[PDB]
Amino acid sequence: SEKIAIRDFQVGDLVLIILDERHDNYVLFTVSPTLYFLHSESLPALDLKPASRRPWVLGKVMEKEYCQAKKAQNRFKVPLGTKFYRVKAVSWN
Amino acid sequence: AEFSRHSEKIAIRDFQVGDLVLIILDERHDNYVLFTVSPTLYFLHSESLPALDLKPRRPWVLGKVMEKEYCQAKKAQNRFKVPLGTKFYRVKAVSWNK
């Protein structure tokens, strides 16, 4: 049976996707100090939307992209220089 | 394989001793449960609450399964708020960090 990854996310991992209101974004539930932000493109297929939002959904990792915040005002509400991932995911059930 | 990917995943069904798990508050059953995708309920044993820093409010903790016991409700009024005849598990668990 499949388990949910909570760190070191790989393509094909099952993940718990949760709302992070501080960063105005969905993230992967993790014990890591690194932020894994859900790519905006993946929201529709997970029955998620860009005013109250569902707290969590299960998904499967399809893609991840390494990023560094090079502008202070960014869509992720992270400080300048933050190193993070953007993750595309699809639904699982 | 010469090595395993170690301690990077939590179980969400068919829980086995030693599994890492997400423990969550089940308000409708007035009890902590293992987060699961299966219809079977896995209730946290009352013995396990103090060492997890829970009280008989905190929404969730990561844990490790120390024991599971398959049970059936014999009375309609019971601490788990389940109908008479419900089959469920009681799980002992300790905190897990890393």
Residue numbers in the entry:
A (entry chain A): 1493 to 1542, 1549 to 1591
B (entry chain C): 1487 to 1542, 1551 to 1592
Sentences from the paper on this structure:
As a core molecular machinery in mammalian autophagy, the ULK complex is composed of a serine–threonine ULK1/2 kinase, ATG13, ATG101, and FIP200 (also named as RB1CC1), and functions as a master regulator in the initiation of autophagy under the nutrient deprivation condition by linking the upstream nutrient sensors with the downstream autophagy machines. The ULK complex initiates the autophagosome formation, and has recently been implicated in selective autophagy by interacting with autophagy receptors through its FIP200 subunit. Here, we discover that the interactions of FIP200 Claw domain with autophagy receptors CCPG1 and Optineurin can be regulated by the phosphorylation in their respective FIP200-binding regions. In all, our findings uncover a general and phosphoregulatable binding mode shared by many autophagy receptors to interact with FIP200 Claw for autophagosome biogenesis, and are valuable for further understanding the molecular mechanism of selective autophagy.
Interestingly, we also determined an apo-form crystal structure of the FIP200 Claw dimer, in which the highly positively charged LHP region of one Claw monomer is occupied by an aromatic Phe residue together with a preceding negatively charged Glu residue from the remaining sequences of the N-terminal cleaved 3C protease site of a neighboring FIP200 Claw dimer, likely due to crystal packing. Moreover, the dimerization of the FIP200 Claw domain in the FIP200 Claw/p-CCPG1 FIR2 complex is mediated by more additional polar interactions, such as the two Arg–Asp pairs (Arg1491–Asp1500) and two Arg-Glu pairs (Arg1499-Glu1494) of salt bridges, and buries a much larger surface area compared with that of the apo-form FIP200 Claw (~786 vs ~730 Å2).
